[PDB]
C-alpha cells in the first residue's frame with residue numbers, strides 16, 4: 001500500500017520518543033534506554049484510507065547518517081516542549097538543516113509543541129503559531145502523556161505529504 005516515511009526531530013528531552021511510542025503503542029512511556037532509538041512501522045487508517053507509517057524517532061544530536069535520514073524522510077515533525085525555551089529556539093536549526101539536505105523550502109513538516117499538559121509554560125502559543133506561519137506549516141500542541149493532539153499531529157503530517 002502507500003507508505004509514508006515520517007521523521008521525528010528536535011532537541012534532547014522534548015518528548016520525541018514518548019510521542020512516537022504513544023502513536024505506535026497507544027501508551028505513555030516515562031523513559032527510554034536509547035538502545036538505538038530507531039524505527040517503527042504501523043498500519044493506520046487516515047481519512048478512510050488504510051496506509052503504512054514508517055516512523056523514525058531520532059536522537060537530539062554521524063553527520064552522514066543524519067543527512068541520510070533527512071534525505072530519505074518524506075515528512076518531518078519538528079518538536080519542542082512548551083516548558084523549554086531553548087528547545088523552541090533550536091527549532092530554526094532543525095528546519096534549516098532539513099531544507100538544506102532536501103534542497104527544498106517546501107518540505108512537508110509540522111511544528112509540534114509537546115508537554116502541553118504541563119503548568120510551567122514558557123512558550124506562548126502565539127509565538128509558535130508565528131514561527132509556523134513564517135515557514136508556511138501547521139502548528140499543533142501535543143501531550144504524549146495525556147495523548148492530547150498526538151493523532152492530529154502525525155495525521156496532519158501525512159496530509160501535508162499528500163497535499164505537497
Ligand SMILES: Nc1nc2c(ncn2[C@@H]2O[C@H](COP(=O)(O)OP(=O)(O)NP(=O)(O)O)[C@@H](O)[C@H]2O)c(=O)[nH]1
Pocket residue numbers: 010011012013014015016017018019029030031032034058059060061114115116117118142143144145146
Ligand atoms: N509531562 C509530560 N512529560 C512528557 C511528555 N512527553 C514526554 N515527557 C517526559 O519528558 C522526558 C523526555 O522524553 P523522551 O521521549 O525521552 O524525549 P526525547 O526527546 O526522546 N529525548 P532524547 O532526545 O534524549 O532521545 C521523559 O521523562 C518523558 O517521560 C508530555 O507530553 N508531558
Ligand SMILES: [Ca+2]
Pocket residue numbers: 099100101102103
Ligand atoms: Ca542543499
Ligand SMILES: [Mg+2]
Pocket residue numbers: 016017018032037057058059
Ligand atoms: Mg528519544
